[PDB]
């Protein structure tokens with residue numbers, strides 16, 4: 395199906411991103427205990443669990459919307475963290491992986 | 504000087520980004536001749552010359568608008584190019600630099 399081909403492709407892509415070694419910082423909403431003041435600085439939090447739910451809730455009706463949420467995961471991380479932190483490093487490694495999977499899927503608007 | 508402090512800060516930041524060694528791929532619009540199918544995949548092209556113009560035209564009335572344009576330069580490049588390409592490398596080097604200058608200016612809280 396035309397909306398169900400999108401769903402399948404995104405579910406595949408998201409699952410692969412989630413299984414990647416460098417995804418571990420981004421699997422759930424940042425915990426206050428782990429990052430006090432994070433939620434005062436970061437206005438639009440995002441994480442892969444929230445993305446999983448959004449996907450199951452049929453929110454990702456286009457490539458644009460999926461891309462923006464995943465990209466926000468990376469840009470939040472780069473805004474909050476210093477450039478040579480492990481968190482920043484993971485974000486760029488996983489972003490590379492992300493873009494290779496997007497392209498591998500022939501994913502388009 | 505409340506809108507003109509913003510202008511000054513942005514002009515400084517943009518100039519520094521433009522003077523950086525790794526900015527050379529992003530100084531003018533991607534040419535169709537030099538990149539096949541680029542404009543089919545990349546929906547919102549952006550570059551530092553267009554940003555210079557937008558700045559000179561008083562388009563950047565907020566930090567948000569400036570951030571989005573410059574971020575898009577990087578994310579366009581990373582979506583389109585393979586991860587070990589010189590273009591992708593430049594993008595991450597210059598993105599690091601960018602986030603350091605933004606933070607240095609107190610332009611993210």
Ligand SMILES: Cc1cc(=O)n(C)c2cc(NS(C)(=O)=O)ccc12
Nearest residue numbers: 419422423424425428429471474481
């Ligand atoms: C400190 C910190 C920054 C950050 O950008 N992320 C994504 C984190 C993730 C963490 N893991 S978790 C269990 O809160 O999702 C812990 C600390 C950070």
Ligand SMILES: Cc1cc(=O)n(C)c2cc(NS(C)(=O)=O)ccc12
Nearest residue numbers: 528529531532533534537538580590
């Ligand atoms: C193919 C290509 C990709 C890219 O991301 N950028 C920024 C380019 C820049 C180029 N230089 S220019 C002078 O056309 O803007 C040429 C090709 C590419």
